[PDB]
Chains A and B, each alone.
With several copies, the nearest count.
Chain A
Amino acid sequence: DDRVLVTETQVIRETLWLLCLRSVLEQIAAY
């Protein structure tokens, strides 16, 4: 199975736009 392998800081920027990785994101998604 292939994956994109995003960097780390890119996630926070994406999270701001929305405002274990599958777990932590799942919570912010609920927001």
Chain B
Amino acid sequence: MIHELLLALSGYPGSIFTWNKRSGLQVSQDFPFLHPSETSVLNRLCRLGTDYIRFTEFIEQYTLHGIYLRAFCTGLDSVLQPYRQALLDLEQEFLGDPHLSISHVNYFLDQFQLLFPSVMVVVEQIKSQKIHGCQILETVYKHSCGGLPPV
């Protein structure tokens, strides 16, 4: 189930983690093998997966036109690189000792959980206001004076 999840957090949905076009990633229903209390933390964990999927779908779509939009997505993958790299690691730690639970996996994301949310509305302002041209170099700058150090 661990390697099952680490793919769901990568952009591949399956039977355990269904995909909905409006809401986002979420667990289907109660599962007998697992506990009924975990059905929550996963839903808290998917609030992160939905961000990466809606990210990479937009990144590929390139959608509006202009070089400053092309380069924004070109750079948007660079900030998103430590997310992937930190996800490849989780499998290595689980390959060593088979006593690690979802608690530790949820704990490992830590920084990504408080970063994506603030870098989600920056994309939404673009696709909802047709920000064409060099005006992006301000719409991203007006959000660069944020307090959150990571952002």
Contact = CB atoms under 8 A, between A and B. Distances in A.
Contact of A16 (B35, B38, B41, B103): B103
B37 interface: yes
Nearest to A10: B35
Nearest to B14: A20
B32 to A, nearest CB: 14
A17 interface: yes
B103 A14 contact: no
Contacts of B101: 13
B102 to A, nearest CB: 8
Interface residues of B, number: 6
Interface in B21-47: 35, 37-38, 41
Interface in A1-24: 13-14, 16-17
Interface in B94-109: 101, 103
Contacts of A14: 35, 37
Contacts of B103: 16-17
B56 to A, nearest CB: 14
Nearest to B102: A17
Interface of A: 13-14, 16-17
8 contacts: A13-B101, A14-B35, A14-B37, A16-B103, A17-B37, A17-B38, A17-B41, A17-B103
Given A17-B37, A17-B38, A17-B41, 5 more contacts: A13-B101, A14-B35, A14-B37, A16-B103, A17-B103
